[PDB]
Design a protein around this ligand. Structure first.
Ligand SMILES: [Cl-]
Ligand SMILES: [Cl-]
Ligand SMILES: [Cl-]
Ligand SMILES: [Cl-]
Ligand SMILES: [Cl-]
Ligand SMILES: [Cl-]
Ligand SMILES: [Cl-]
Ligand SMILES: [Cl-]
Ligand SMILES: [Cl-]
Ligand SMILES: [Cl-]
Ligand SMILES: [Cl-]
Ligand SMILES: [Cl-]
Ligand SMILES: [Cl-]
Ligand SMILES: [Cl-]
Ligand SMILES: [Cl-]
Ligand SMILES: [Cl-]
Ligand SMILES: [Cl-]
Ligand SMILES: [Cl-]
Ligand SMILES: [Cl-]
Ligand SMILES: [Cl-]
Ligand SMILES: [Cl-]
Ligand SMILES: [Cl-]
Ligand SMILES: [Cl-]
Ligand SMILES: [Cl-]
Lengths: 267, 267, 267, 267, 267, 267
């Protein structure tokens, strides 16, 4: 096979088009149920809140997994992390209602303390096998200069957990209690410097910002003086790539390209 | 020293040529004994099987270290990981016989569970100090989008273990039982986006694919319909860089450049 | 806000100039007290010794944190790591005296064994909250091909510990014993491939080299035959970027850009 | 309450009889489903195989959890751990069929490597919440001079996991996927120096020994020359306490006595 | 020395009386400031609430360290651990006010997740060196059948941390920031099966029980129907050893006897 | 087998005399090479220095394994742990010379930081398999009130490592580099409350105390005012059990009794 192509460029295009059937025309078109994985309460709204409302409005069931409890998100010396986590849970329930999301799984690892371990893969794999989502969204763990370990670990653990949910010897007691292996159809990484699919969110921008500001403990007015400019600059970064005012960017690749593929950066 | 050069380009070339005596003409020419480090059974054959056969055919002694047992490599709900691991040991013995390899060290860490720790360094440094190889091959841990932790950890632990095998206070009980410090002459990284040395394997391609397919548990005919196209695409990516049909790529650098070198990407 | 810009370029420049007030003109001008974090004894003098002497000579109080004891830095089978660590403490005290540094905190983690953990963050945040430095310097953990885990871990732990030092629920017993949250004004990363600020050290080069050679155990004459060429080639790399003979490079970014910022590589 | 008793002996007897309703007349009489937790394949048969057969013969459904794979159980240099594990799985299925057991959960931690961690607790609580057993058996982790960490860790993790299975904030994703909190009705510890309940197994001793010897890889004839005398000495130790030839001993206590009870050794 | 005694009994008594100056007449008589270390909110009140009130009433400053947040203490599926932990902080402040305690350090490790590690030692040693207490109370980690890892770990970590607070190379950054080594004068273990000092609390029993029931989330009326009988049975167990109605028991030993002492059980 | 004994006492005596061939008459009589494992430098001399000199004088080759470097053993704020450790290595070489010991393996784990892990077992098993000792001595990890984690961990790791050195799948790279499995003939535990074999050291007491005081950094004259009385009180405790002035005690048991043996405290 692949004996009659003559150049690498020809093989490459034939591998993507024919063998992997990859395309970026509308990667989310067939989804019925997706899971959006966030490191902290508010990252699904920040990274992809317009696209979550577009999906919910088309009748896609969007479920969150939140990896941590947001305990550390305050500079108030009188607000304990326990009290903040309870406040953030209610904030995310109000944000998610605005975006059409009706189910959140809380892993409850402490903020700044998310482990990078098989145990946390097992939590993700248990929920993937229970819910059988078509798509999974998570942060791109290769974002340049990303300095928060919870973000880098969420992205790597989500990619690994999507792969290992298909393997019956990984977390085998799930198979023994009736949670069968599941093969997700696509992963999409948000918070990405290298998007290859952009969703125009220009007419949902105000709704997105409203869903973000529902995390009131995080976005005081003072903080918003910097964050609204930031968030509009990011959405213009994405939207300008497809000639629209505001966009949300995602990186999607064939499953093969997440492993031993030396030209994965050509898409 | 280095006071008479005038530009960074001049200093850089003098550092590589004269001080480090670095050359990519024939980096494997003097090797008598090399160790090829693979994350899982079948990675030496996939990443570099053509070059392993060339080296064996020249009378180089090629030894494998396999970091993990391949336990997780099945989607059959009836095949336990213990039985798969036993099957894969036999597959690698048959693959290795085709490529001229006569010695495999099995570290037996569980697949998907290779630790990143001093303990696993010590296992690599014990074998390096026992066998005194001239060269060590391992995956490039900086391959973009590599999402298997066993692969990233094998590359980093091999680079570190080659450096630490020279240090008598590292794993000092080896020195006390007669395994002296050893200084490897070169490292070469396979599975790389940034090769700087390519071996033409055009006339060994069918043998490389045979050696790969000897891992029958991983390469069923259905899976091969994707994997032969992929493997030929990858070998054309490398071969095209030197104007040949099929190549295997390696990244080789002076030892110095694996540490505090801000222009290491200029080779 | 940010509704009247019409291109990403416009928004980006307005976000950096107006909202973040970021400028690379003289990022160190207002500093009264800085901490320089080194993985091993000698890294502050190698990565940034000229700039340390410039800062001391302006009356800046420069403090080191050394993460590890340098135990493993010998190929002499007769010198224990314990004896080497004692030797290296004295070498660093001599080197530091040459550069105007009068205080070093020794975390005493063993060389090649620095953990990547909350416990080590807590050590950094205790010292940052006690000393209240204006600036913190550390290695850039994203230097390409950096293969020493103690270097990568120092960079990431330093950036995370600057951020978490401002959070009263992080390491809360410090607040309870009277070490209040502290907000550092800038971070600067040395050992970097992507500097955006270069200090001319041409007239302090011989003093820098003297301060490095004070670490006699590391820089024997034989080793210096390779290391003087290396260090001059690095200083030319940096100095050529601003048209001077010898430079030390730093990467400085707005705090926001260390997290979720897809265009952080544009500075 | 408890204001009218006037001696500790009076209060103790009232607390056990009235408040805790504790007795040891026939602690297993009401059981419909029990789980027997073994560190390695063959420990349920060795510690309590006669009682398992009594229970199965009364219509009790007896389920095993085996914590490890038995990988390390050979002194044959030609038998890999992987092959041993596969052999021991078949040995246990044969042993279990002799004793009436029809379901085994295999956690598959490697022998000599069982962790003592929240992750292993979560595997035990998942199975306890799925199966809702009335009783759980495990080794007594306080057996004097017990030197195998897998045995000590299995006893502690079993006791902890029975308590934590009732707590909806412990391993909360189970509650989210439909596995509700479960309250086991008794624990019984085997392999105990301090039994307080003994089962007469005099007429099932030959069956018990057959079930043990079905683990042929462990009990070669040579090893059996020591192990039959050992096993009969232990069963006489227990049976002599109740005036019978062969017994199996268990320690049962009120749940309260597993925590902050300074007279728990008085039963 | 000790050459003129003739029997072990003679030597033993002379070691305790003359060399170690040990006695148990009134071990708390000279204390001005004590720390009571509890695993969870409510353990100081349960283990030793009468004695805490006796000490405060004498003008001793009693300070708590609470190792964990009590997150897991509920069987209500509607109450999150975060909310529980906030509730229990308030409960403890009310309980402590009743007993005369005015300061509590909260380590905030999650309940059922307290580590056994150098990091937690370092938190105890920072507080011991800041507060310089004369006495420290903690659970006896050798209580038979104690099945809660947080209780066993608190007792061992407290004993260890008392010893290591005297050592300037342990947690050396405390010494560098001005927290000098401290030598506690006594440890007293509560929750013990082997008390050697009993405090009569007969006239403070109703106050102790009030301070316990202030932890309303733990002691609902239904649970109290078992817990008041238990608590009265325990206090009778201790008081009967000194011929009083209700007592609290402590185990106190010379520092030497916590290490390499084969007759430590003779006191 | 064992069908003709009628009582447990009969079976027990026959199991020990005939099947296990257990004798406490002269357990060390056949030894040619023993390893004495100490947690810190000085514990072999303190726990068993008289016996080590008896054994050396009979021509037994006594080798030490010291698990830690003694870093923490000082209350001088000017003496670093690095310097202490180097001083203590020389102290031990002088002490060991007095006792006839000519070889010490230093594992160099930091004092107070000995792990309890497979990695440290592998260090012990590599030395056991290299040296093939007839006997191994270690602390009894079940000594009551032993509060130093390095002592408890040394005892358990030594017992485990003796057992696992016989198993070719444990630390299998040893067998691959030519270190075959080894079966030690006896373990003897020192620092024990339950000795069953006592060596009379009455005429070697002053030599033992000289070998202890050779650890000058630990035994200043001030400290010795407590430690001489302690050490003579301990040797009297042991010697009185066999009617001699000064003894060293050991606990020896058949290998079988270290596992699943409910009457192991009957010897
Ligand atoms: Cl075909
Ligand atoms: Cl085809
Ligand atoms: Cl990370
Ligand atoms: Cl405004
Ligand atoms: Cl020169
Ligand atoms: Cl020269
Ligand atoms: Cl990784
Ligand atoms: Cl085909
Ligand atoms: Cl505004
Ligand atoms: Cl505004
Ligand atoms: Cl790292
Ligand atoms: Cl020269
Ligand atoms: Cl009542
Ligand atoms: Cl009542
Ligand atoms: Cl254990
Ligand atoms: Cl026979
Ligand atoms: Cl004297
Ligand atoms: Cl005297
Ligand atoms: Cl524990
Ligand atoms: Cl009532
Ligand atoms: Cl027979
Ligand atoms: Cl026989
Ligand atoms: Cl321990
Ligand atoms: Cl004197």
């Amino acid at each position: 096979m692949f004996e009659n192509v003559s150049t690498f460029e020809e093989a490459f295009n034939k591998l993507l088009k024919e063998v992997l059937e990859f395309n970026l025309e509308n990667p989310f078109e067939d989804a019925k149920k997706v899971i959006c994985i966030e490191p902290h309460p508010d990252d699904c709204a920040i990274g992809m809140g317009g696209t979550i409302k577009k999906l919910s409005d088309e009748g896609v069931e969007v479920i969150y997994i939140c990896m941590t409890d947001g305990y550390m998100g305050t500079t108030d010396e009188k607000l304990s992390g326990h009290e903040l986590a309870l406040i953030r849970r209610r904030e995310e329930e109000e944000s998610a209602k605005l975006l059409g999301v009706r189910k959140i799984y809380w892993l409850n690892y402490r903020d700044t303390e998310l482990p990078y371990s098989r145990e946390v893969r097992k939590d993700l794999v248990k929920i993937i096998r229970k819910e059988k989502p078509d798509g999974v969204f998570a942060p791109d763990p290769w974002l340049p200069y990303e300095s928060h370990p919870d973000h880098r670990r969420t992205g790597f653990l989500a990619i690994e957990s999507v792969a290992f949910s298909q393997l019956p010897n990984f977390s085998n007691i799930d198979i023994d209690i009736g949670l069968k292996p599941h093969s997700v159809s696509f992963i999409a990484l948000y918070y990405t410097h290298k998007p290859n699919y952009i969703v125009d969110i220009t007419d949902l921008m105000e709704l997105k910002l409203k869903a973000i500001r529902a995390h009131r403990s995080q976005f005081t007015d003072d903080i918003w003086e910097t964050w609204e400019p930031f968030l509009r600059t990011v959405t213009m970064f994405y939207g300008e790539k497809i000639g629209v005012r505001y966009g949300e960017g995602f990186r999607v690749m064939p499953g093969l390209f997440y492993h031993i593929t030396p030209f994965a950066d050509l898409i």
